[PDB]
Write a protein that binds this DNA or RNA. Structure first.
Length: 74
RNA sequence: GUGAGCGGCAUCCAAGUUACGCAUCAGAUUCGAGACGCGAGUAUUUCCCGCGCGGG
């Protein structure tokens, strides 16, 4: 519902990802961190990492992907 | 549930042995403790400096 550009600045060098580093993956990890903070460590991580503020793209075969590009490494 | 999560560059090792700051070189040439303190000139006022008195 709104096009955005997420920019992250590093204070320490990161591990260069071997494969794609997706924005939705990081957002899901942070959301799971929030759910852990509120509830605890007994939560199922798979029950909360889809509750992200990103809209989804669905193809013909029903395959859907979050609308968040993989992070650009410069 | 960030191709995530988890993971000691760590252990051991002599900078050491030997080596003359030494040989040579005038602090010399000239010159006095021996000289230097008044017995030096008349009588009573003259031009003047500060102002009766200090004073050329």
């Amino acid at each position: 519902m709104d096009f955005l550009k997420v920019t992250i600045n590093l204070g320490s060098p990161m591990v260069e990802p071997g494969d794609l580093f997706h924005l939705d993956a990081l957002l899901g990890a942070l959301r799971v961190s929030e759910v852990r903070a509120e509830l605890g460590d007994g939560i199922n991580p798979r029950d909360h990492h889809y509750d992200l503020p990103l809209e989804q793209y669905r193809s013909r075969s029903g395959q859907w992907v979050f609308k968040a590009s993989a992070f650009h490494i410069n």
